[PDB]
Write a protein that binds this ligand. Structure first.
Ligand SMILES: O=C(O)CN(CC(=O)O)CC(=O)O
Ligand code: NI
Ligand code: NI
Lengths: 139, 21
């Protein structure tokens, strides 16, 4: 699968649920899994969002440092879903704060991080097909 | 340190989530 396509479709879905149209089985599974993740932990995402202090100056370092912490002890499919949801939070905050250009940057950062830092783990653990298999019963 | 806190909670939530599959 193309990680760029997965990121772009995921970001567009998350923004469209907020009423913002951003120009840009795996997709459906990730969408449902991220929605389920979000609804379980709204209190934590709200605190995360309030502390984000998103500006074009801080956005990249904020993303990089959070993702580094997220994978400090390794990777699992839950961490992958959280990676997408955290990127989604930054995208939603971007448009809410009239910094919509940052969405393109976040999509780039997510795509390149997947391809550089997560591709080996994903393939080693059966590819995106394994994620679809794992979460299928929850759909 | 903001990112350490965020990342720590995302890991906790991630691990709870995946362990419930
Ligand atoms: O981020 C990770 O934990 C996985 N990294 C290994 C590493 O960071 O040395 C794969 C890579 O980035 O090629
Ligand atoms: Ni649309
Ligand atoms: Ni890496």
């Amino acid at each position: 699968y193309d990680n760029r396509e997965i990121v772009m479709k995921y970001i567009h879905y998350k923004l469209s649920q907020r009423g913002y149209e951003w120009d840009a089985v795996v997709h459906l599974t990730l969408r449902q899994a991220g929605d389920d993740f979000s609804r379980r932990y709204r209190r934590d995402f709200a605190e995360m969002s309030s502390q984000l202090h998103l500006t074009p100056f801080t956005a990249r370092g904020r993303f990089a440092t959070v993702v580094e912490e997220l994978f400090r002890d390794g990777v699992n499919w839950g961490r992958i879903v959280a990676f997408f949801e955290f990127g989604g939070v930054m995208c939603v905050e971007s448009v809410n704060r009239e910094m919509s250009p940052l969405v393109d940057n976040i999509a780039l950062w997510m795509t390149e991080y997947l391809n550089r830092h997560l591709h080996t783990w994903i393939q080693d653990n059966g590819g995106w097909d394994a994620f679809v298999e794992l979460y299928g019963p929850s759909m | 340190w903001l990112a350490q806190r965020l990342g720590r909670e995302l890991r906790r939530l991630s691990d709870e989530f995946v362990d419930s599959f």
